[PDB]
Structure formats: structure tokens, C-alpha cells
Amino acid sequence: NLYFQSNSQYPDFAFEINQNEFLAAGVREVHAVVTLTATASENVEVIIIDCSGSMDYPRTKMMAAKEATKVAIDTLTDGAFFAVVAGTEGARVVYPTGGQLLRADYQSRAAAKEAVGRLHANGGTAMGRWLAQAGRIFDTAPSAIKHAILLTDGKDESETPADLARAIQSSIGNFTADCRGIGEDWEPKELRKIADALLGTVGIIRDPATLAEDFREMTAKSMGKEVADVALRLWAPKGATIRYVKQVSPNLADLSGMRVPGDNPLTGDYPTGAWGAESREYHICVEVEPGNIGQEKLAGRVQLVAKDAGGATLLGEGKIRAVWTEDTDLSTRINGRVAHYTGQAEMAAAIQEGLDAQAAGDLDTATARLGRAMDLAVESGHEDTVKMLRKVTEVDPATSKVRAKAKVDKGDAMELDVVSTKTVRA
Ligand code: NA
Question: Which Pfam families match (predicted)?
Fold first, then answer.
């Protein structure tokens, strides 16, 4: 009963803890997978469109961006606030035009589409300035569910990486963002930096004709959100420390560096953003001072807490336990979910590292890393990732062993890098 509300209609959350709590004599590491499933106030959606000069080459990119933005505008819920930002070396708000958010209705939608129609390709790319302009818009709606769609076809060449980092840090906690890169001339690492910090994902659009449906689905999912700002609140006893907190499903995102200190050092908050009707899994590892054989400790207490307008609401809670035993039939048991997601994190890293080696012609390193990734993808039944790995590798006819290809299609490599963090469920 520790939290008071300011008023609500939040999703109902089912909270499960998945662990083998039994540890052998010396053991300090406790692992658990937390499954969170949400079942059934204002939305603000900012659509940020790259209008740099390269967007006309080929012209299908700019045309798709316009088509797709119009689909997004039509997919907004009646009453949702929205804006469109044209990104170049600067950022210009192209709708609305009076410096105040307007609700989506027949009139505002039509006016927004007309403004989108007048977008043209010219200039450079400074993504941080796009984020900073979105942030100014979002600051006008502090209690809203706030989400940005960012589309680019290029690298962030008109500002420094420290400039981008400064804009990312200023955006954290203000809005969430999903990013899309169209074509092959942008940098997965750049968009990943933005999307990971802002609790979203990156996607690649290899064919401009698919952008509209992609925008439709991103907007619809955003409109499904029902609660704006949810923290995963983790308590661990004195001397116990958090090794890591990672989202592992549907995507891998390490939250460890995002910890926000709570009221005391024993409690910290890890941001999860907005929730609709959805499910996520997290992998938590706590290092604890080992107890005696026979002794049980609480290694961690996990709460999910919605923060809203000067109040908070406890949405769910679970416990991460630690019991020391000499019964090896209990301690040697492998928690299937922990093992699975440990492998998914390893796989994602192996893909990225393998692709980076391959790009440089460091082929023996690529073969070892992409080989490990393949082994994990096969073992976990991640058939989509197996299929993408087959595009960047080949079976050496002599050894029958898998090797990294010397020459790969740039798009195939980029696509795999982008979806390296998409996991398969347990
Ligand atoms: Na560009």
C-alpha cells in the first residue's frame, strides 16, 4: 500500500518469475527471467521524416515517405495529438503550423496531408536537431503517451556523434521512438543508439513500396498504448548487486546502464516506457552474498510501477529467490528460459561481431562468430535468423563446415545486423 494515485484505466499485468532458485554451495549469481503480459490517456505522435537531398535518389524514397506519412496520419486515433517534422541539417515543423498541438480530425488530417505533399528533398542530416525539435513538441504534453517515428536514408553527417548523444540524453524519459532506415546508405549503429535509448526498435526498408504498411503498423501499435511510463523497480538486499537487467523478448535491449536511483541505494528503476496489450520478457542477474546451505534469501524484489501526474500505481510484483543446497539434483537443473535467453543475447552479439569482421575482410574471425551465431539460431529454432545467416555464409564443400562469404550483398548484411536483436520467444 505504499503508492498513492493522483486520480485509472491501466492494463492488467500478469507477472511471472522463471528461475531455478537452488544454488550450489559457493554460488553468488542468481538468474531469473520475468515475463510481463499486459491485457486490456492522450496520445501524441511525432513523425520525423528525413528530407535530405539524397531522398530524391531514387525518387521512390521521398514518394514513399510521403505516402507512408499520410497513412500514418490516417491511422491516428480521432483526438490524438500529432506533428510532422521535416529533418535536414535543421528541423522544421511542417504540421501543425501555429506552435500548438492539434487533435486529429477530418480537418487537421487533410491539412497535414497537404503539408506532407509539399515536402521536398534538400540539405543535410543532423538527427539530434530532429530529436530536439520533437522534444520541444512533446514538452507541451507532459502526461501524454508520447511516441516518435523516425525515418532516414543516410548517415548523421551534419553533426558530431557527441551532438547526437546530447540530443538522445535530453530525449530520454520524454518520448519513445522507433526508427526506420530506407535503402542501404545509413548506419545501423546510429539508429540503434537512438532506438535503444528511447525504448524502441530499428527496422530496415529494403523496398520503398513496403514503407506505408510499416508506418501503418507502427502507428496502430502506438495508438494501442494505454499507460505512458512504467518502471521496472528492482530492490536487492545490502551487499547484493545487479549484474544486469535486459529486455530479452521480443527484442534484446540491455537496460543496465539506464538505472535511475530510487529513494535509497537498494532500489533502482529501469524504464520500460508505454504499454498496450503486449508481452515482454526480461533477464535479471543479481550477485548476492552466499548464504549457508539450507538458507534462503530474497535476491531481489521486482515491481512494475506506473508513474502518472504526481502519483504512482503498483501494477505487479514478483520475487527472485536464492536457496543454497547440496542436493545437486536441485541445483544442476537448467532453467530453460534463463538458458534460452542467455543464448539469444550471445547470438545477437555474435551476429554483430561476425558481420563487422566480414565487412573488413577479417574472414576467419567472421567464420568463427557467424558460426557460433548459426549454432545458437539453429538450437533456439530462430528460423528467420537462420535464413538470413545463410545469405552471408556458405557451406565449404570440402569440410562441409560453414564459412563466412568473402563477398556478401550489402543489403543482406545490413538487414541481419538490424534484426540481430530480434529474438525468438522461449
Ligand atoms: Na540523406
Answer: VWA_3, VWA_3_C
